Each structure stands twice: as structure tokens, then as C-alpha cells.
Design a protein around this ligand. Structure first.
Ligand SMILES: O=C(O)c1cnc2ccccc2n1
Ligand SMILES: *C(=O)c1cnc2ccccc2n1
Lengths: 10, 8
DNA sequence: ACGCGCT
DNA sequence: AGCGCGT
């Protein structure tokens, strides 16, 4: 995720 | 991702 | 003293 | 496996 906590997605 | 001072 | 989080 | 950090 994020970044952070990429995306989702990308 | 770990949170020990900042937790990202 | 340290890794988490889905589309 | 490389992203996102500071008490
Ligand atoms: O803010 C917080 C923080 C800062 N530095 C660190 C270094 C190593 C392990 C954990 C750490 N946590
Ligand atoms: C969390 O799992 C994690 C891992 N590496 C990092 C590098 C820089 C900032 C934050 C981070 N968080």
C-alpha cells in the first residue's frame, strides 16, 4: 500500500 | 512498517 | 531498538 | 530487491 501502508496497486 | 519510533 | 501492506 | 522513518 501507499507507500507506505504502491497503491494498491502500482 | 515496523513501529518501534515512527510506525510506517 | 525495524520491517508492513493488495490491487 | 530496491517504495515508506524518527522517538
Ligand atoms: O523512531 C523510531 C526508530 C528510530 N530508529 C530506529 C533504529 C533502529 C530500529 C528502530 C528504530 N526506530
Ligand atoms: C516497514 O516495514 C518499513 C520498511 N522500510 C522502511 C524504510 C524507510 C522508511 C520506512 C520503512 N518502513
Amino acid at each position: 500500500t501507499x507507500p507506505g501502508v504502491t497503491x494498491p496497486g502500482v | 512498517x515496523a513501529x518501534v519510533x515512527a510506525x510506517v
